[PDB]
Scaffold this active site. Structure first.
Site, PDB file in Angstrom:
ATOM      1  NE  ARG A   1      26.223  28.484  31.982  1.00 13.04           N
ATOM      2  CZ  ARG A   1      26.782  27.310  32.243  1.00 13.04           C
ATOM      3  NH1 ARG A   1      28.057  27.078  31.980  1.00 13.04           N
ATOM      4  NH2 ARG A   1      26.043  26.346  32.782  1.00 13.04           N
ATOM      5  NE  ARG A   2      34.398  33.753  29.287  1.00 11.28           N
ATOM      6  CZ  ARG A   2      35.448  34.228  29.942  1.00 11.28           C
ATOM      7  NH1 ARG A   2      35.720  33.849  31.180  1.00 11.28           N
ATOM      8  NH2 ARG A   2      36.245  35.107  29.340  1.00 11.28           N
TER       9      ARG A   2
ATOM     10  CD  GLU B   1      32.098  24.611  39.418  1.00 12.00           C
ATOM     11  OE1 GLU B   1      31.056  25.250  39.677  1.00 12.00           O
ATOM     12  OE2 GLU B   1      33.041  25.090  38.755  1.00 12.00           O
TER      13      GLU B   1
END
Ligand SMILES: O=P(O)(O)OC[C@H]1O[C@@H]([n+]2cccc(S)c2)[C@H](O)[C@@H]1O
Lengths: 472, 309
Positions: free
Chosen positions: B190-191, B251
């Site tokens: 998570r960014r 992904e």
């Protein structure tokens, strides 16, 4: 002014006397806290007052007694005394710490489980790395750099900021051996988390400064680029805004090599930092230090031969803050240049006094790219060999970044660049001689030297050997 | 009368060591002369003012005006020749030129050539002889490195490099001719939350020999193994991702389709429930999870390696 210093002097004496007289750990911590608050009050004002308080601490011997407190067993007094030290390690104090203070701070850095003590000693190492080269070798040869890396492993924000600044200052003031030791000790990999993390912008900015200063060294570029840290420099520099950081001399002498690095990320970092410094210090009355250093000329060279938008923007805004007008971009296709392009290029490279001479002789792109020693010496008036060598350096600069498509037929410029980045200056001579990729395998040394203009024998030998070998 | 002031000034200017610096500075401070100011070792990066300072320190103060008018800098200073001094700068006397050359050799012997040198050639020259290091700038400006030296000739050295003395050239040539002869782990994070732990994981794995890709389907193609960072709310976007909008969803779906080793890394995040998540992705919950410890990061990385291929 010094009136605030006069007010603080009785306060300084009272705080130091209480600190020295105190024998209990808590009383010692209280006196240290008094000194801490006084120092921070001076810092919030301004620089002269804090420097004076640090001078008084040194004169009283309070820094030696502070070191005594560093050797003290109690954890709280060590921690908060170390906070005082990291606040007061001004340049004269770093000397005395370089003398005797070193060797005790290393002992602090050996054990770092307490978070506040770890932060304080990390800041102390950060400040001591700036002092001198021998301090850098003494700290790095010991476990100090390992302590900095292990602190970078931790997630404390202020600790991470301090370690990033420590690694940066060590990179600027270390030297060949120190930076090679940092590279072998995997400094770039541990700088990667500090630059990549989105939590704090200043942390990434400082880590990018550190990695750019590493990348300034040609040997280090191997390991820095294989680390992958520099990949984050350009998006970062494109993202953040120097102005809000502005709202939020020797160091400039350190930064200027970043502008003349020849490396993209280093130039971006140098442009950003120098633009921020130019803004904040042009808010001040004087702007002479940048001209003393030569920053204006380096930024002009950056704008004139820029290939990349972010560096162009940063250098343009930095020069726009100053009184000088922005240098104007040059057309890459130099063989197609005219008299006015030559005049503009001469004015940009600093040879403005020879603009009249070049205009009278009507020098253009062909003439400029096939100018020789004799023509400058006699026709154009560059009698001085030093001036001619300077003009040749700038002419090589122009010829390295030029568009030869209108002249070249076999993509010879890429071949010359593939042999060596500085070989590309000879492309115009080779193509004007009629040589292409196929014709090079019949070239001789005398032909190169006389017609092409490759004066250096080593370059000629490499070019001939490479042509004869790979072109077949 | 003895010349002690000049010797102490030379000691301070080119000092590498603190104690000698302190002693010479205090000795000169006792005298009326002001302390000489230290010089930057990186001479190739010098400017006009550095040259002026160095000239004033070495005693050649009268030639400061001449050097300033011709604008001599680090490159010019380190590639100055007999003719340039004789005509351009005004050193008509051969004695004065020889003195300036002695001091220039002094400067060139102790200089920082990292910004210019690429193959650590200065150490090689010093290893042959301490006084050979003065030629490093000439050799590197010629384009020569450690590999290129085994094709160098006497005339090339003499003309381009500037090694006037024949004995030095012979030794250098003889010595050169004789002695000179798909990421393993993909990180999905998570960014906002996963980035810092992802950085630590990537650097730890690269230290231990595992190539890691960070920061798209071809990225999942290249990955030998897939590592998902279970940051607090890591699958927050992935929950009910019927449209597969989240990059993490794409992904991990691709990783399951390819069959790459998927190793969830739980650090501060609970195991997401199967029912809320799409059915295809409920399988990753069955995969083994790894706890991450701030106190022992190396232990966690060793555990990952034990689970890693
Ligand atoms: O010698 P330097 O690094 O120029 O500054 C002297 C000391 O000042 C402290 N400090 C803190 C907060 C604000 C300011 S202005 C300065 C730094 O930690 C340094 O140790």
């Amino acid at each position: 002014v010094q009136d605030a210093l006069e007010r603080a002097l009785p306060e300084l004496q009272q705080a130091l006397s209480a600190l020295k007289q105190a024998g209990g750990a808590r009383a010692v911590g209280a006196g240290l806290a008094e000194v801490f608050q006084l120092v921070e009050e001076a810092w919030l004002l301004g620089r002269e007052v804090a420097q004076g308080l640090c001078d008084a601490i040194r004169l009283d011997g309070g820094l030696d007694l502070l070191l005594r407190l560093l050797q003290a067993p109690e954890l709280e007094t060590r921690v908060q005394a170390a906070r005082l030290l990291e606040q007061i390690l001004v340049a004269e104090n770093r000397d005395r710490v370089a003398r005797i203070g070193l060797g005790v701070i290393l002992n602090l850095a050996k054990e770092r489980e307490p978070v506040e003590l770890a932060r304080s000693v990390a800041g102390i190492l950060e400040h001591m790395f700036k002092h001198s080269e021998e301090t850098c070798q003494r700290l790095v040869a010991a476990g100090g750099l390992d302590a900095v890396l292990y602190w970078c492993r931790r997630t404390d924000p202020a600790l991470l900021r301090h370690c990033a600044l420590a690694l940066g200052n060590c990179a600027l003031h270390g030297g060949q051996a120190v930076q090679r030791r940092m590279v072998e000790k995997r400094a770039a990999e541990w700088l990667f988390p500090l630059a990549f993390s989105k939590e704090d912008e200043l942390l990434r900015l400082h880590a990018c400064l550190a990695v750019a200063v590493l990348a300034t060294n040609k040997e280090v570029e191997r390991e820095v680029e294989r680390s992958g840290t520099l990949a984050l420099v350009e998006p970062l520099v494109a993202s953040l805004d120097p102005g809000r950081f502005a709202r939020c001399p020797d160091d400039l002498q350190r930064l200027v090599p970043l502008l003349d690095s020849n490396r993209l990320e280093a130039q971006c970092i140098g442009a950003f930092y120098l633009c921020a410094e130019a803004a904040i210090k042009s808010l001040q009355g004087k702007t002479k230090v940048f001209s003393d250093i030569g920053a204006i000329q380096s930024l002009k060279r950056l704008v004139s031969y820029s290939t990349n938008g972010t560096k162009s923007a940063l250098a343009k805004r930095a020069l726009r803050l100053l009184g000088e007008e922005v240098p104007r971009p040059i057309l890459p296709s130099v063989p197609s240049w005219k008299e006015a392009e030559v005049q503009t290029w001469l004015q940009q490279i600093g040879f403005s006094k020879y603009c009249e001479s070049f205009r009278e002789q009507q020098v253009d792109g062909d003439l400029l790219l096939r100018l020789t020693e004799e023509e400058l010496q006699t026709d154009l008036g560059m009698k001085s060999g030093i001036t001619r060598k300077r003009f040749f350096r700038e002419l090589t600069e122009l010829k390295t970044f030029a568009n030869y498509s209108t002249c070249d037929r076999s993509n010879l410029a890429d071949w010359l660049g593939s042999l060596d980045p500085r070989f590309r200056q000879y492309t115009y001579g080779l193509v004007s001689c009629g040589l292409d990729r196929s014709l090079l395998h019949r070239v001789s040394e005398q032909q190169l030297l006389e017609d092409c203009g490759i004066h250096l024998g080593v370059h000629r030998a490499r070019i001939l050997t490479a042509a004869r070998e790979m072109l077949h | 009368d003895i010349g002690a002031i000049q010797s102490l000034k030379r000691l301070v200017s080119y000092s590498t060591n603190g104690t000698k610096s302190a002693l010479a500075k205090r000795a000169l401070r006792l005298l009326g002369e002001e302390v000489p100011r230290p010089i930057l070792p990186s001479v190739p990066s010098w400017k006009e003012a550095e040259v002026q300072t160095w000239l004033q320190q070495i005693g050649f103060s009268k030639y400061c005006e001449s050097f300033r008018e011709q604008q001599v800098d680090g490159d010019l200073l380190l590639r100055l020749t007999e003719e340039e001094l004789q005509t351009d700068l005004g050193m008509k006397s051969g004695i004065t030129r020889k003195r300036f050359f002695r001091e220039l050799t002094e400067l060139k012997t102790f200089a920082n050539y990292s910004t210019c040198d690429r193959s650590n050639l200065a150490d090689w020259l010093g290893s042959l002889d301490p006084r050979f290091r003065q030629y490093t700038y000439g050799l590197v400006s010629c384009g020569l490195d450690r590999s290129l030296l085994h094709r160098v000739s006497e005339q090339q050295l003499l003309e381009d490099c500037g090694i006037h003395l024949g004995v030095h050239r012979a030794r250098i040539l003889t010595a050169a001719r004789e002695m000179l002869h798909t990421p393993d782990v993909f990180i999905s994070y998570r960014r906002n939350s996963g980035s810092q732990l992802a950085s630590l994981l990537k650097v730890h794995l690269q230290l231990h020999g595992f190539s890691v890709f960070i920061d798209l389907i071809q990225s999942v193609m290249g990955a030998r193994n897939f590592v998902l960072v279970l940051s607090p709310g890591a699958l927050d976007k992935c929950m009910q991702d019927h449209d597969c909008k989240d990059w993490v969803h794409k992904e991990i779906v691709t990783a399951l389709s390819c069959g790459k080793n998927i190793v969830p890394i739980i650090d501060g995040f609970e195991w997401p429930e199967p029912q809320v998540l799409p059915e295809d992705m409920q399988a990753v919950l069955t995969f083994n999870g790894i706890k991450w410890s701030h106190e022992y990061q190396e232990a966690t990385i060793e555990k990952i390696i034990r689970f890693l291929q």
